[PDB]
């Protein structure tokens, strides 16, 4: 004998502010750790605070909270399609703490980005997922998102980038 | 050869090149915009997107289109290169366009310069390999557009 029932909490989504930096970094680390890349986080709180909230930063961040109490975040920026001749939005990070993965916070963050895209005349909302991350893939497939698997992303960074400039 | 920022007057030439590139990428039919649409978006007041023109002796020979990304791991902006193209009769202009983008990346405190390539496009892959670029092939890009995007918003 036991009993299951629905609980209801009011959740909040708001734009992030400079004071959110320490929490945002905390969540960035948690996400990177889930993505098996903890060691790749090389920034610090002031690095995040300054770059994310610079005047004319291309990047925007949202916080998700419960009587908050932050429970998740998203970081995104505008992209462009030359084929559509329209801006798009690219979602870089999306994360909800494990404890709160059932309440629909992740989905609503993604929905609000979609609303922003449509409201701003954008052709596409896009993001990336690790090929081994089947739970996330299942979710993205379920909402009608489609893989762009003909494309491979290439990167210049570190010394190779410096040499290309020099 | 000359590399310069694109201006609204370049829109016609940019679109012609966009179509040339799309055609090579086996996607000519995906270009659904006109010059007007390019003007209104690419050259909108407050536009997040930039373009570079490559010219040889006053003649436009190629272009790039790019925007700023962000790495939460690095705590740094990056640049994402959407389009890079040099017309056949002039194919080292492409390398020159990339150099300018890299210089822009370095001056603007960017950690990464990135772009995408079709897996069948071996000439592009060969070129990118030759400049020290590395494939980020653990990731798959996902997209919502059209009805799926509209329905998600609602």
């Amino acid at each position: 004998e036991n009993l299951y029932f629905q609980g209801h909490m009011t959740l909040e989504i708001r734009p992030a502010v400079p004071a959110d930096a320490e929490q945002i970094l905390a969540f960035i680390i948690e996400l990177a750790d889930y993505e098996r890349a903890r060691h790749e986080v090389v920034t610090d709180v002031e690095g995040i605070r300054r770059s994310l909230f610079a005047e004319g930063s291309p990047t925007r961040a949202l916080m998700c909270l419960s009587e908050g109490r932050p429970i998740g975040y998203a970081v995104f920026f505008y992209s462009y399609s030359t084929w559509l001749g329209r801006n798009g939005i690219y979602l870089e990070d999306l994360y909800v703490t494990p404890e709160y993965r059932g309440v629909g916070a992740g989905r609503r963050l993604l929905r609000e980005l979609a609303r922003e895209a449509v409201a701003n005349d954008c052709g596409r909302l896009e993001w990336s997922v690790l090929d081994w991350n089947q739970p996330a893939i299942d979710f993205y497939r379920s909402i009608g998102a489609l893989p762009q698997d003909e494309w491979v992303r290439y990167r210049l960074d570190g010394e190779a980038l410096r040499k290309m400039a020099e």
Side-chain angles (χ1 to χ4, degrees), chain A:
Chain A
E1 59 167 312
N2 66 336
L3 169 275
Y4 301 96
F5 67 100
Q6 294 310 113
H8 315 284
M9 35 174 52
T10 91
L11 304 176
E12 185 192 358
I13 291 176
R14 63 160 171 81
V17 293
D20 291 317
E22 22 285 286
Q23 182 63 260
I24 293 172
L25 178 59
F27 282 159
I28 285 157
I29 290 158
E30 289 179 34
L31 179 58
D33 188 279
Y34 176 82
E35 289 173 344
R36 302 172 179 169
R38 179 176 200 107
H39 55 282
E40 297 292 353
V41 183
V42 295
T43 185
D44 54 23
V45 67
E46 296 313 323
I48 291 292
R49 177 156 23 240
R50 270 82 160 278
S51 59
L52 205 49
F53 306 97
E55 214 276 333
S57 170
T59 312
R60 280 188 291 164
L62 293 172
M63 301 302 303
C64 189
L65 312 94
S66 153
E67 309 285 302
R69 285 200 262 103
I71 62 162
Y73 81 110
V75 172
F76 61 98
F77 49 83
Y78 286 103
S79 57
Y80 189 77
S81 174
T82 54
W83 298 352
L84 298 181
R86 290 176 91 181
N87 292 147
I89 292 173
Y90 184 87
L91 171 63
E92 174 51 43
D93 284 8
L94 180 66
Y95 174 81
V96 174
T97 200
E99 206 185 340
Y100 288 91
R101 277 195 182 112
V103 290
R107 191 191 288 262
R108 190 61 179 256
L109 280 165
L110 208 271
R111 163 163 194 230
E112 287 308 307
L113 288 190
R115 293 171 92 266
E116 183 180 318
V118 174
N120 290 109
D121 201 20
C122 291
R124 320 208 278 219
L125 175 64
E126 295 174 306
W127 57 90
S128 294
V129 63
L130 286 164
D131 55 24
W132 57 259
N133 188 3
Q134 201 56 49
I137 290 159
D138 289 337
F139 169 71
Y140 301 136
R141 289 272 173 124
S142 82
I143 65 170
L146 302 174
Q148 310 302 118
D149 44 53
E150 292 197 338
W151 295 88
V152 184
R153 201 204 321 169
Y154 271 77
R155 177 189 293 179
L156 278 178
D157 65 4
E159 179 163 298
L161 181 60
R162 288 169 226 139
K163 293 279 192 185
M164 195 73 235
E166 296 180 359

